[PDB]
Swiss-Prot record, chain A:
Organism: Enterobacteria phage N4 (Bacteriophage N4)
Localisation per UniProt entry: Virion
Descriptive protein name: Non-contractile tail sheath
Superkingdom of this protein's organism: Viruses
Gene: 65
Other information: It is uncommon for short-tailed phages to have a tail tube inside a non-contractile sheath.
Function: Assembles to form the non-contractile sheath that surrounds the tail tube. Allows viral attachment to the host by binding the bacterial outer membrane protein NfrA.
Record's subunit section: Interacts with host NfrA receptor; this interaction is essential for viral adsorption to the host.
First and last residues shown, out of full length: 150 to 198 of 1382
Length: 49, 50
């Protein structure tokens, strides 16, 4: 099963999938992801879209 | 209420409260109820409670 990245949309306040052409067309509410630990450093992450 | 409007944040929105007696304070987690009227996207007035 392929996992696609999800990005927050400030205008509608929902986690909407990137990769519009070939991807899931579902949008999830906030509170799905709750952050309480230290985040991943920006240097390690790879940029997509 | 006076005014209410949204914020650029993901979560919150801003609200004034108007005339209040001096000996009063608010703590986080308090709940407020109101019946207010807004303008729909189509341009028609509506009413709601929250």
């Amino acid at each position: 099963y392929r996992l696609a990245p999800y990005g927050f949309n400030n205008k509608t306040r929902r986690w909407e999938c990137l990769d519009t052409k070939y991807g899931t067309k579902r949008t999830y509410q906030a509170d799905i992801f709750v952050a309480t630990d230290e985040d991943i450093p920006e240097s390690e992450m790879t940029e997509v879209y | 209420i006076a005014a209410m409007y949204n914020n650029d944040d993901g979560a919150t929105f801003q609200m004034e409260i108007g005339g209040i007696h001096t000996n009063a304070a608010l703590a986080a987690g308090d709940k407020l109820q109101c019946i207010w009227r807004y303008l729909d996207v189509n341009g028609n007035a509506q009413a709601a409670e929250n």
